[PDB]
Amino acid sequence: AQFVRNLAEKAPVLVNAAVTYSKPRLATFWHYAKVELVPPTPAEIPTAIQS
Amino acid sequence: AQFVRNLAEKAPVLVNAAVTYSKPRLATFWHYAKVELVPPTPAEIPTAIQS
């Protein structure tokens, strides 16, 4: 009852820990995804068309 | 009647002459329109984005 609610508060802390562990793995994925904040360069278009 | 039909045959020759005169003026328009037989180059995209 109230103890289960207290357990839920501990579970909320556990959920925060779950978010905490997920973020660095997500940060590694972000490092791969951080290459572009704007659309890709039209500079290598020549290389691609030539290939 | 038949003379009007004969006049129509002459008119058909006149229509061919009308097509004949239109084609060189159209050819000048074609010279302006003959620049691209395929989609435009992605080479100047840099110039445009920089401008």
Q: Which of A42, A46, A49 has the CB atom closest to B49's CB atom? A: A42
Q: Give CA–CA dist B51/B36, Å, rounded.
A: 23
3-class SS string, chain A: CHHHHHHHHHHHHHHHHHHHHHHHHHHHHHHHHCCCCCCCCCCCHHHHHHC
What contacts B40, CB < 8 A, 6 or more positions away? none
Torsion of CA B38, B44, B49, B51, to 10 degrees: -130
Chain B residues whose CB is inside 8 A of the A42 CB are: 42, 45-46, 49
What contacts B45, CB < 8 A, 6 or more positions away? A42, A45
Q: How was this structure determined?
A: cryo-EM
The CB density around residue B45, as the number of other CB atoms within 10 Å, is 14
Q: Do B43 and A43 touch (CB under 8 A)?
A: no
Contact, A24 vs B31, CB < 8 A?
A: no
Chain A: closest CA distance from residue B44 (Å): 9
Chain A: closest CA distance from residue B32 (Å): 26
> What does the DSSP assignment read for B1-51?
-HHHHHHHHHHHHHHHHHHHHHHHHHHHHHHHHTT-SSPPPSSSHHHHHH-
What contacts B43, CB < 8 A, 6 or more positions away? A45, A46
> CA nearest B48 in A: which residue?
A42
| Cited resolution, angstroms | 6.2
Q: Give CA–CA dist A42/B49, Å, rounded.
A: 9
Q: Give CA–CA dist B7/A3, Å, rounded.
A: 109
